[PDB]
Assembly symmetry: D4
Homo-oligomer: 162 residues x 8
């Protein structure tokens, strides 16, 4: 089945984070593609991918990058699709550089930004699912089940151990 979400990331290194987005889309049965696109090393690839995303039938782009993280923003510059950004944790600044480079977009070109790291990747997939669920009742039901199970799995008290 044809992809409706594209997960893009700057590097193989970033996949340790972005694989969490990929897994969650698979769990919710959302067709997607998962690709490497570097804003700095493959800028013409990025332009083409973003320019053509909507005509290819994509509905949401999830983009992950670290450091001077320009991939999500430049993607948004070239597509009218919703673009969700995942800051990848960086070695020295622990993703603070990633976060600010993604979230602080000037008015006019949005990127919906999620938490630094694996939590953010998981939540980008879930936010993408929330978007798609607006027009897909089967998926809406899967997402409601996911959230109900999440709630039901929280115990009343902690386990005490050594």
């Amino acid at each position: 089945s044809a992809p409706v979400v594209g997960i893009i990331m700057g590097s193989q290194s970033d996949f340790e984070t972005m694989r969490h987005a990929d897994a969650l889309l698979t769990e919710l049965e959302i067709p997607h593609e998962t690709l490497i696109v570097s804003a700095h090393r493959t800028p013409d690839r990025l332009a083409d991918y973003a320019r053509t995303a909507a005509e290819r039938g994509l509905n949401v782009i999830i983009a992950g990058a670290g450091g001077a993280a320009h991939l999500p923003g430049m993607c948004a510059a070239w597509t009218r699709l919703p673009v969700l950004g995942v800051p990848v944790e960086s070695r020295a600044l622990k993703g603070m550089d990633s976060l600010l480079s993604i979230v602080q977009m000037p008015g006019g070109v949005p990127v919906g930004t999620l938490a630094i790291g694996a939590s953010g990747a998981k939540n980008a997939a879930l936010l993408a699912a929330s978007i798609l669920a607006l027009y897909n009742p089967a998926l809406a039901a899967r997402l409601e089940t996911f959230r109900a199970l999440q709630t039901a799995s929280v115990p009343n008290s902690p386990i005490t151990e050594d």
Copy 2:
């Protein structure tokens, strides 16, 4: 003409920022409601608003707050709708507290976070529009017009 986006904000003071979201939705002719809901002062109002949002026909919630900014996250806790969060600039820490308290949601309950301040308010509206445009071709066309005009309007050189 029932609302499809809800703009909610913690206080009247936040409206100096969130009015930019309200203005953009109006510009793109997206039916919406603009309300005050405080996570800390009106928590029952928040719970009811978020719980009933989907059945009332809302598709996106835009939530703005400053300081220990809990409104977007708590909204997302009660609805499966996409929730977009706008950090309002705070007096002392200039919205860094707002930003971290909104964006750093643990896995399972997302908030799509935009920039601190007026830029983020405008972008929350535009992100909401981009979501709605997936299903609404007339809106998609207006959004493409908006983006085309934004691009075309940038001057080539600065003025004295």
Copy 3:
């Protein structure tokens, strides 16, 4: 005996921190309950717990959370009891996100915030004890003994070792 302090936390993971609060209340012989309550995954549980805390005889709530840490603040929104907040250390931002999400409450709804991590948990228990000691002379004496022993246990000079 019926609890007079409730220790609540967002997750089992948080208990590695919050167990220090639990231990100190036990040392000072303060009856308490220790529970998991997630602001984001069990919001209706949180509302109910906080709403009913005072009628159940609780006097102080100690709440610990990390990241976008909303549990202490939302608890305070629903109870007139004193709520003390413990920022749990987070992976990327080392509890700076936890700290700011808890301490920066707007005027009207307070959370008394303690240090990031285990120190904060211990001190939340001690601050809770200070509050209860205002009306409980036996406990006041135990707390004064605790503080006196603390002072007396500080040596005059350090040990030099390899």
Copy 4:
């Protein structure tokens, strides 16, 4: 009508912030004293104030300071009473220095810390009130009225 809360602050300049605590205690009719005590300029004054607080009948101390803000912590070192700390906004670092020097108390000597600035001053007073309300039913009722009015007073929508 002997004081049950002590509001202390490092300097006259801090009163622009700590007056909000003073005002709230007066509003709730909580007997209190409002004083200047500097950890660095009047350390003996501080030691004596903190040492004698409990025997004078104080139940809570609210301490505000800015910069390398040591007043709350040093107060807590000398008394078993609950000490609440208000970080005063500083000129250069906007109270981030105040905040860290107050909140990061090592285990054994607590300070319950509130937000930077006027919000924190108000909340220190309200937290003091919530502590006193545990033992004082008339005050508990006034506090519940305060919170009910705060909640009810939030408008439903913003104004132009």
Copy 5:
């Protein structure tokens, strides 16, 4: 008199900062062009500008932007010319977002980053001049004069 340095900036508002680079290049009589190019609003303009820079005879690009400041980095992605980046002071975060989004380029695509604000704009021009001076002896002499006057002009003591 074809330009050998390109000063580009994200918006008209950035010119309040980047005019200091423009002024310095004029002072040193370095032929240049001063343009607006937005990474986010005019990405195709940016790609074309950067792609063609070397063949048009540019030797250095000075790029200024604020916020999520992507203009310098994306320019460097499309050209082998040296790209110098000026973080423009932003409203909320005072250019800390600008700084990190420009300087933290991963290995393979460099941007030489200067200070936040007007100091950085001036220094980008001077760094461009120091690069051009390697090949242009008349310019090298003017640059040495500039530096000599800067050094000699510092007073020995302050004024009341």
Copy 6:
């Protein structure tokens, strides 16, 4: 011989840092005492130590603390002697809390602050030595020798190894 520098620290834990100050004073043959004094757990000890320091013949106090680091500042509040502060690296905030708590003293009560961690401890000893060398020619000569050897020990180029 009677001490002319006092090295004080909040805890045994802090000695892993402050031992570097102790070692350097010993290397430069400066008599000193090395003590534990906690601002928060032994406040009366601190008051007495600082109050009496000058009459005891101390010339400089080096104080090290971490977290909400109040020891150097409260020492300075009670003595007219020069007080030098060493921020001890803290677990979560890596000494940023220590640094700001020490260096940001209001005008009127100074603390000369050195770098976070072991570098700061070493430099507090060296700054203390610089102060004492103003009136002690033998020590001035030892300090000049120390600085000359430091300079002479810097090689011209690095070693390349795996």
Copy 7:
């Protein structure tokens, strides 16, 4: 009446801060010189100043600078005298850049660092005085008077 403290600063603009050090030394009747020395614009002036300081009879150097603040550290590199550093508040980063570039000296070359801004300038003068007081009993007495008046002058309560 030859100077025993040297106050040096990077620029005329820094004097708005460093004048507070100058004023305090005058108040305590400590002979001093107040000069501009720029690490970046007058590096040879700096090297000569620091190299000759001890033989000219200076006992303490107070050095103030902002931004990438190198003046105190480079002074300490050339003299065995105690060097005290005052971070001057910078426009964008409010002296956080000043602070880190001064305080974070690696082991072997110390700078005693004071607070950002005017507080630090005053405290650098007072720390210099406390150093000189070790050898000068008349000055020690004036310093004790200064501290006694500072302590005694703190009011007991704030004013409306």
Copy 8:
């Protein structure tokens, strides 16, 4: 062949970072010298090195330092050559101190600053190469080849592994 780039660093410790600059210049066949120069421990060496750099035929200086990182700026104060600065990652503050000490030069004396750590060192070499390539067609061709290979080496999708 005579050096046209000088790589200088404050310490042997810094070479773990700066060796990446050295390697890249060697890969692009740019003659260079690699030296230790400490701003704080060998200030007269720094003055001389910077003063004489241009007359010796150097075209670019790459300077790396950590902490209170003054080496690049003081080098720039003494030479009209382009000076590129590499912030070395520091223990407590993870190079934030290094970064601000290097990049925040006042107008009049520039340092072109690169990323914290090894990325920055590599990019300082590449920026130096970009500068030299303006007047050296052989090198310009090597640099274009380097960038083309970089682009061509980016795969289209990530590898999934345990």
